[PDB]
C-alpha cells in the first residue's frame, strides 16, 4: 500500500501549481512570452525536482 | 522579451542578450522641415525574425 500511495502522491504533485500560472506546461508556453514563461517553468521544475 | 512591430519585423535582441542598449535624441540632425522620408522600417512580413 505505502508504495502505491507514494506513486499516487508523486503523480498528484504534477497537478499542483507551485505558485505558477497553471500546472500544464503547454498552457504556460502558449499564454506567456518565453522570457516570462521561463520563470513559471523554473518554479514548476523546482517543485517537481 | 519585448514584442512589438519593430522587435518582431525589424530587429530582435536575443533572449539571452548580453550588452547595453544606448539611445539618445537625434531631432536636431535626423529631422527636417520637409521630412526625413529616407529612414524606413518594415511593418509587413510572413514570419517573426
Swiss-Prot record, chain B:
Q: Per its UniProt entry, which superkingdom is the organism in?
A: Viruses
Changing residue 41 to F: reported impact? Decreased HLA binding to NF9 epitope. Increased binding affinity to human ACE2
Q: Which stretches does the entry tag as region Immunodominant HLA epitope recognized by the CD8+?
A: 36-44
Question: In the UniProt annotation, what is the result of changing residue 40 to R?
Answer: In strain: Delta/B.1.617.2, Epsilon/B.1.427/B.1.429, Kappa/B.1.617.1, Lambda/C.37, 19B/501Y, Omicron/BA.4, Omicron/BA.5, Omicron/BQ.1.1; Contributes to cellular immunity evasion and increases infectivity
How does it associate, per the subunit comment?
Binds to host ACE2. RBD also interacts with the N-linked glycan on 'Asn-90' of ACE2. Cleavage of S generates a polybasic C-terminal sequence on S1 that binds to host Neuropilin-1 (NRP1) and Neuropilin-2 (NRP2) receptors. Interacts with host integrin alpha-5/beta-1 (ITGA5:ITGB1) and with ACE2 in complex with integrin alpha-5/beta-1 (ITGA5:ITGB1). May interact via cytoplasmic c-terminus with M protein. May interact (via N-terminus) with host bilirubin and biliverdin, thereby preventing antibody binding to the SARS-CoV-2 spike NTD via an allosteric mechanism.
* Role description: Attaches the virion to the cell membrane by interacting with host receptor, initiating the infection. The major receptor is host ACE2. When S2/S2' has been cleaved, binding to the receptor triggers direct fusion at the cell membrane. When S2/S2' has not been cleaved, binding to the receptor results in internalization of the virus by endocytosis using host TFRC and GRM2 and leading to fusion of the virion membrane with the host endosomal membrane. Alternatively, may use NRP1/NRP2 and integrin as entry receptors.
- The molecule here is called Spike protein S1
Q: What is the lineage of its organism?
A: Viruses, Riboviria, Orthornavirae, Pisuviricota, Pisoniviricetes
Say which residues of the entire protein are included here.
413 to 461 of 1273
Amino acid at each position: 500500500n505505502h508504495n502505491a500511495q507514494a506513486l499516487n502522491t508523486l503523480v498528484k504533485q504534477l497537478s499542483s501549481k507551485f505558485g505558477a500560472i497553471s500546472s500544464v506546461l503547454n498552457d504556460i508556453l502558449s499564454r506567456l512570452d518565453p522570457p516570462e514563461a521561463e520563470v513559471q517553468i523554473d518554479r514548476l521544475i523546482t517543485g517537481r525536482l | 522579451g519585448q514584442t512589438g512591430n519593430i522587435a518582431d519585423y525589424n530587429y530582435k535582441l536575443p533572449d539571452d542578450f548580453t550588452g547595453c542598449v544606448i539611445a539618445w535624441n537625434s531631432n536636431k540632425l535626423d529631422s527636417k522641415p520637409s521630412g526625413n522620408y529616407n529612414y524606413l522600417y518594415r511593418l509587413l512580413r510572413k514570419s517573426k525574425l
